[PDB]
Subunit: 285 residues, 4 copies
C-alpha cells in the first residue's frame, strides 16, 4: 500500500516500524503524508536507526504540531524544546512512567503526540509498553458505551507533583524532573470519559491511574468501583505492544488514544532518551 515509505506493523492492534526514509533529510509532501497516515492508522510508529541532530529532531515534531513542552521535564542544553528521559546507572528512585497512562492530562489541553529519540539505551531492558484506547473503548458492549458515553472525569497532577506527592516517601530524581509548584500541580481539570480523535474521528476511552481522580458528580465510592473496572479492562495484554529500544531509534506516539509505560527492568544500567512534545486541543466528546 504505502508508496514512499516501507511500513512494517508490529501487532494486529497498534504499532509499526517505518523504514526506507531518512529523517536527516527534509521530507517531501507525499512522503510525509504517508508518515502521517501511518501514525493515524498505527498509533505508535518508530523509525530505527536515525542519527538526527536535536535540530532535525525539533523540526520533525513540528510537522505534527507546535512544540508544547511538558511541565516536569528538564530541557537539554540550548534546546528548551528538547526534554530528557534520562536515568543514571545509580537507580533506587521512582521510575518515570512506571504505570500505564497518557502524558500530562492534568492540563486543560494536553499533548496530542510526543516523539522520542533513543540516545543511549542498554543492550536489553528498559522497553516501553503501549496500548490502544481505540481498542479499549471498541471492545466494550454498546450498552456499556451508552451507559458511560456521557460521563466526564476530573484529572489532576497531585500524585506526580501535588499534595499527595508532597506527603509521600520518595521522589523522582532531579535529572529529568523540575521542582514544581504544589498548587499548580494539584490543579483539577475536566475531560470526557470518551474522547473523539480530532483527525480519525474514531472514539477512544480516556482515563488513567496516574491523574484521573474521580468521575465528575459521583461519590468516591462509585467512582473507584467504575474507574477500577476500566483500568482492569483497558490494560489487558491483548491490547498492548512492546517497543524495544536501540540507539538512534525514533518513535512517535499518539497521546490521546494510546497509553504507554516504562518497564523498570534495567537497574544498574544507563538509559537516556530525548523527547519533544507536540500540542493538542481540549479533548472533545
Amino acid at each position: 500500500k504505502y508508496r514512499f515509505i516501507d511500513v512494517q506493523p508490529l501487532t494486529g492492534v497498534l504499532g509499526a516500524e517505518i523504514t526506507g526514509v531518512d529523517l536527516r533529510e527534509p521530507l517531501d509532501d507525499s512522503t510525509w503524508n504517508e508518515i502521517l497516515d501511518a501514525f493515524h492508522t498505527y498509533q505508535v510508529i518508530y523509525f530505527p536507526g536515525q542519527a538526527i541532530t536535536n535540530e532535525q529532531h525539533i523540526a520533525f515534531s513540528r510537522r505534527f504540531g507546535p512544540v508544547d513542552p511538558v511541565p516536569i521535564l528538564k530541557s537539554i542544553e540550548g534546546y528548551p524544546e528538547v526534554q530528557m528521559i534520562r536515568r543514571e546507572a545509580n537507580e533506587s528512585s521512582r521510575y518515570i512512567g512506571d504505570d500505564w497512562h497518557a502524558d500530562s492530562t492534568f492540563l486543560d489541553a494536553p499533548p496530542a503526540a510526543v516523539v522520542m529519540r533513543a540516545i543511549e539505551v542498554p543492550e536489553y531492558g528498559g522497553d516501553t509498553g503501549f496500548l490502544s484506547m481505540y481498542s479499549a473503548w471498541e471492545t466494550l458492549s454498546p450498552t456499556m458505551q451508552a451507559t458511560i458515553e456521557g460521563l466526564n472525569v476530573v484529572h489532576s497532577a497531585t500524585k506526580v507533583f501535588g499534595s499527595l506527592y508532597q506527603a509521600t516517601n520518595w521522589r523522582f530524581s532531579n535529572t529529568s524532573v523540575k521542582v514544581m509548584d504544589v498548587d499548580a500541580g494539584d490543579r483539577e481539570t475536566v475531560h470526557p470519559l470518551v474522547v473523539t480523535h480530532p483527525v480519525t474521528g474514531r472514539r477512544a476511552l480516556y482515563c488513567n491511574q496516574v491523574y484521573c481522580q474521580k468521575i465528575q458528580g459521583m461519590t468516591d465510592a462509585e467512582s473507584k468501583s467504575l474507574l477500577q473496572f476500566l483500568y482492569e479492562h483497558a490494560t489487558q495484554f491483548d491490547f498492548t505492544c512492546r517497543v524495544r529500544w536501540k540507539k538512534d531509534q525514533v518513535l512517535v506516539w499518539d497521546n490521546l488514544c494510546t497509553m504507554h509505560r516504562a518497564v523498570p527492568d534495567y537497574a544498574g544500567k544507563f538509559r537516556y532518551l530525548t523527547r519533544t512534545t507536540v500540542a493538542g486541543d481540549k479533548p472533545s466528546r
Copy 2:
C-alpha cells in the same frame, strides 16, 4: 402518630412498622383497611403479633391485597393447596431457605407485589428475618449514577434455585418445603428493569438480587459482574436494613418490590415453621 383505627409503631427510621389494635379473625371494616394499607406502602414491611387466626382467615387476609398465587418451588399443606410452607426440622443439614438477600421469584414475568407470613411454630430466640428498602438503596446513589443506570434492564432467571447451576451443586434444598420443580422452568429467562417505580406510590426504587439476577441485558459477563457487584455492596449496607423477630402467631406482610428479605440461619437443631400465601402482582415497569 396520625392514625384512627390502628396503632402503628415503626421499627427503624428507614423501613418497618408494628401494627396493633385489630383482630384478623374479624373481617376489617373499611375505615380500618384503608389506614392499614397507607402504612404498608410507607413502611414497606408491617407485622401483627399474636393473631391466632386460621388458614381460612389466613387466605382471606392475603386475598384483600390481591389474589392468592403460590410460588413454584414451595409446597402447600394437607387440605390447603393455597397455604405454603416454611418448614424446617430440628435436625436439618439441608440448605436454609432464602439465606441471601432477595425478592421472591423475580424470574416470573410479573413477579409478586407482596407476601404474608404467619408464625406457626417459631423458636423463642433464633430465626429472625431481615429486610431492607431498595428505595433507600437507590435514593442514596448520586444523581449522576442514577442518571447513568436508570435505563438498564436485567435478565433474571431461576437457573440457580432449580436450573443447571442448582442441579450441579452440593447440598440441595430442604425437601420439606421444596417441590420437584424442574430444570426448564428454572433456566427460564425473563427481563425487568434495573430501576422500578411502585404502582401505588410513584417512588423510584432499585431491582436486583444475587439469587436471580444473572446479567445486565447487553453487557459482557465481566462488565455486568462489576456493576451488579457494586450495587449489592451498596444496597445491602446495614443502615438500609432492619430485622424482624418472630413470636408464634406473629402475622406479617412484606412488599416484594421495594424491599428485599432473607432468612437468618441461627438455630440449627431447632424447629421453625411459618406459613405464607403470596398475593400476585403486575409486570414491573420503569
Copy 3:
C-alpha cells in the same frame, strides 16, 4: 441454667436481655458472677428499665474493670468517668460510630468492655449494631485460619483525628467530641489479627475499617486485598444483631470480640446516651 437472673437471648449468634436484677443496689456475688458469665457468653447484654444514677453506673462498670475514659469524647458535668454520646436535633455534621469498629483499637491496650446507658432516645430509630468476631473467625476454613493466624495489623487513629482526618470534609460537632492531638492521631500501634479472649480463651478476629491501616510487613497492595476480604466476611448480616434503645436501658459489650456501629436512621431527632469504659490489657494472640 441461670438462677439469679433472667436471660432472654436476642439471636443465636450473640446478644441478650438480662432482667430480674436491680442495678441500683449492690449485687450479691452469685448474681454478679452470672451477670459476667452471661456477658462472657453472649458478648452484648442489656438491662431494660434500670433507672440508675451516675454513681451506681460507675460502680457497676468498676465490677468489669477499672474505669478509664476514652480520648475524644466529652465527660459529663461533675463526673469525669462518664462520657457523652450526645447528638442534637440539628444534623449538620457526621455521625459517631458511623461504620463497624471496636473502640480505640489504636490504643496500645484498648478498652475491654464499655457500658452505655440510654438517657433519652427516639421512639423509633437510633439503633446500635453489634456483631461477633468469634463468629467471624469460627466460620473461616481451618485452612484459612492457619494462613492468617500469625499476622499482625497496624492500627492508627488517623481518619478520626490524625493528618488524614484534618484534610477532607465535615468535622464532628463538639456537642460530645473533644479536640484531639494529631501526633497521637497518626500514632501507630500493632496488635494481632487474631486475638484470644483473656477470660474465655476463645479466639476472635480483630480488624476494623476505622483504625486498621495495614497488615504488618505487607505490601500496600497485599494488605489492601486482604483486609478488604475480612471486612467483607466479618460484616455479613448473619453475624450481627440490633439493639433498640429505650430510656434507662443499660448495656455492656465486649470491646474485644464484638464490633459495633451506630445507625443514622434518626436524622432530625435527639438521642443522648452516656457511657463508661472498662480497660483491658494489650490484646494477645
Copy 4:
C-alpha cells in the same frame, strides 16, 4: 559469559535469543550444557532460523526430557510425538491459549517444558506472551510468602474440555483440538501453590485461572478472593515479555516457572506451529 552459543537476552526479567549453533546437527556436550543452562536462567529461549525436521525436532526435546504428547492436541501424520497449533483463515471459534496459563496442569505431573517451531506464521500478528512466575513469587512480601507458602491448589481440565465446557456458549475448532473424554476432564488434582523448581531450586508461584478451581481447604469465598489477588499480581506487565514469531524459529519455554498465552490479533490470517512436550515430575514444594 556464554562461549559455545550466542545468548542475547530479551528483557531484564525473562527471555533470550540463541544464535551461533545449528540445531540440525547434534549437540556436543559443551554446547548443550550452555543451552540448558540458558533455558534455566532465562526461562524462555528461542532460536531464529532453524529449518529442522520433525525428527531433528523430536531429537532435540528428548535432550530436555521424554516427550509425552499433551492431551487435546492433534498430532501430525507420521509423527505422533509432534502436535499441531494450526488455525485456518476461517477462524472465529475460541482461540487456543487465549488467557495466561501453564500447559495442562490438571495432570498429576504436568510437562516440564515444551519446544515450538514456527512453520508458517503471519507477517505481523499472533505473538505469544510469557511471564515469570519466579518474579510473581519474588515480588511478594516475605510476610506474604510465609502466609501462602503452605497452601495447595486444585487444578482441573474442567473449563477446557470438562463439565462446564460441555454446557457453555461457544466451542473450539478441531483443526488442533481433539474430542476429549468428559470425566477425564473433570478429574481433579492437587499441587502446591509455591513450587521449588527441580534444577534451579528457585521457588515459583504456581496457579492459573484456566485450570485452578480452588485452594484446598478453603471456602469458595476464600479461595475465590485469594487467587483473584494472585492472578492480578502475577500478571503485571513488568513480569511479561513478548515473542514475535517468524518462520523456522524454535522456542523452548519452562512449563513450571512460566505462564504463556496466545494473542488473538491475527483474525483472517493463517498460523501454524508445531510443538513437542517434555515430561516432568509431580510438582513439589
